[PDB]
């Protein structure tokens, strides 16, 4: 029934929907829709970015408390946290927390610089066995979502697989792994999406994205109280829906996969 709901929403909104739900013990796909088609990641890439940063922290190449200085000229659109700290700068950890929790765009660009740019993020991903996902541009041009454009894209199944390696696998140390989950648990801007459908006792760690051409997405580690969690990723692109419609669609898919857990 969840896959029926997905198809009906895609029929209703236009554009394309992508969906993957992953079992964590085996890493096998429980169900997916357009699971091997490419979708723009938008800000959902910011979790992979912070994984790359934490990987450098783990290797002694970076410190969570190192202060990055920047000016007003480095600010791009939608920088709710970094725009308040042009004066005193921010630490690597504060920038990650801003990038994940508020989806601060300058925070992501600042972190991208620390690792060597979008090409270095893609190389990090290749190094951990993701041969599909790719980041090519900076904020905010990576949100352009041109039809057919493979730049800055993932597939629902590949993003699910990579998130399992990062959040539960051995890419990171347990301390850094949990740091990443903790930032995603603290997501502030995902309220109208899967969180709006969560029954009491459920836990979620998530990250949203939004882009041009009606694009929206979410990646999430979630589970019922007392039970094992799963990973879900949902992308949509190519419709004329506004943010609220995009939010509703994702929440409706969340409610269906929750009802059919």
Residue numbers in the entry: 28 to 238, 240 to 252, 254 to 290
What does the paper say about this structure?
The TEM-1 β-lactamase model system has been extensively used to study protein evolution. We apply EVcouplings to computationally design variants of the model protein TEM-1 β-lactamase. Aligning these structures in 3D to a published WT TEM-1 structure (PDB: 1XPB34) revealed that all three have nearly identical Cα backbones to WT TEM-1 (0.26–0.61 Å RMSD over all Cα atoms).
We also searched for local structural changes by examining differences in all pairwise distances between residues, which showed small changes in a one looped region for all three structures (positions 255–257) and in a second loop of 70.a (positions 53–55). Both 80.a and 80.b have 55 amino acid substitutions relative to WT TEM-1, of which 80.a has 15 mutations in the core of the structure and 80.b has 19 in the core. In particular, the 80.a and 70.a designs had between 4-fold and 32-fold increased MIC of four tested antibiotics as well as 24 °C and 6 °C increased Tm, respectively. The 80.a and 80.b designs also had a 4-fold increased MIC of aztreonam, as well as a 16-fold increased MIC of ceftazidime. The two designs that were optimized solely for predicted fitness (i.e., distance unconstrained) both conferred resistance to ampicillin, with the greedy optimized sequence (opt.a) having a MIC equal to WT TEM-1, and the parallel tempering optimized sequence (opt.b) had a large decrease in MIC (roughly 100X less). In summary, nearly all of the designs were able to confer resistance to ampicillin including a design with 84 mutations relative to its closest natural homolog (70.a) and two designs with over 50 mutations (80.a and 80.b). However, we did observe literature-reported globally stabilizing mutations such as M182T in every one of the designed sequences, which has been shown to confer a 7.5 °C increase in Tm as a single substitution. 4, 5). There are five shared mutations near the active site that are in three designs (M69A, E104T, P167T, E168A, E240G) that may contribute to this increased resistance.
